[PDB]
Design a protein around this ligand. Sequence first.
Ligand SMILES: Nc1nc(NC2CC2)c2ncn([C@H]3C=C[C@@H](CO)C3)c2n1
Lengths: 275, 100, 10
Amino acid sequence: SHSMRYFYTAMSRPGRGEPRFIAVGYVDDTQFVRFDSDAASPRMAPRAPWIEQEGPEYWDGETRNMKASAQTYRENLRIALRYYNQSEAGSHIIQVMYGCDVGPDGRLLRGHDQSAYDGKDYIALNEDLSSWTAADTAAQITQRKWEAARVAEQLRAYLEGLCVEWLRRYLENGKETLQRADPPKTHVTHHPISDHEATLRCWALGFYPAEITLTWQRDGEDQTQDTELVETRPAGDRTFQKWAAVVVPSGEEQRYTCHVQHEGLPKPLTLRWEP
Amino acid sequence: MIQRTPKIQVYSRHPAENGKSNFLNCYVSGFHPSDIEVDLLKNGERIEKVEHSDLSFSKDWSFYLLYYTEFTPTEKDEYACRVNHVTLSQPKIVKWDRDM
Amino acid sequence: RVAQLEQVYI
Ligand SMILES: Nc1nc(NC2CC2)c2ncn([C@H]3C=C[C@@H](CO)C3)c2n1
């Protein structure tokens, strides 16, 4: 299964110029485009190698759409001020995420469109792609306007059509990276904390996609509740990192095993500290 | 009026080797609103050439960004990430530990 | 490619 997701952020900044509009696009865990209204010459720009082959009609077209969206979102920030009776002096944020999920055969699984105003749910397109769930009185005003203007049908047309079509195209063009899991490189480090205790840290580096499981066992007993597990983090080269650590009594180190589960690994992986 | 303070991780792209070129990363996430100030420090002083990723957000609407710069770790040089945000009483400094 | 909806005001 695969996904395409776009994330738009619009942020007002009174006495600091017009609102900033930033948009990013992902296929699965890979960012492929960006637009930033604060760039020197604002344009949709490539962020993955497999999108670079797109020609001028693509980039000019996306740039045109981004500029128009920035203007619309700037107006939407103004409308929100009215709905919520807010002052022109405060900074506010609209966030929108939308896109489509497809199955292994390329058929649409689900469409998405949901948003937040100042970090709180605002309005979301329901799974039926025909109705809206509105979080508050303001979003209810929007819901009615959108029912009147047949917005759901237009969005449905995108999600079922163009969204799926281009996702399939991106998946084929970037198949060597997007459809080839990168297994983690793994190792265990050992760090004495005192003469009586030591940290064992199990590393997973350079993996893709981001989903992974990293656990410690003592004598084959799971130690999840005594494990420090850091949030999965970007390496900076389109792959990910994670580690899991336990503090163990000195002398118990060889009883501890680290277990790694990842799509890029054929079978569950088990490691120990090798002195 | 929703506010969430940033989570911070400082780390290298590859396992550190003294004298070997690398990238120093500061990953800030889980924050709201979006304005944030992130500096990478070498021995307490701001590094000038720092780039960052494009602002994005998680399913719960919290923002995340990666700040990074090329660096060559040595035995004695100290590195750190300094983060400021509306939720922070003082800027938070997290030291780089090659073991984390 | 991004959605191409015309002037979607809230
Ligand atoms: N849920 C939602 N909330 C929006 N605005 C809100 C929260 C103030 C919103 N604005 C535009 N869209 C869709 C229309 C075209 C797509 C790209 O822009 C998304 C939206 N979807």
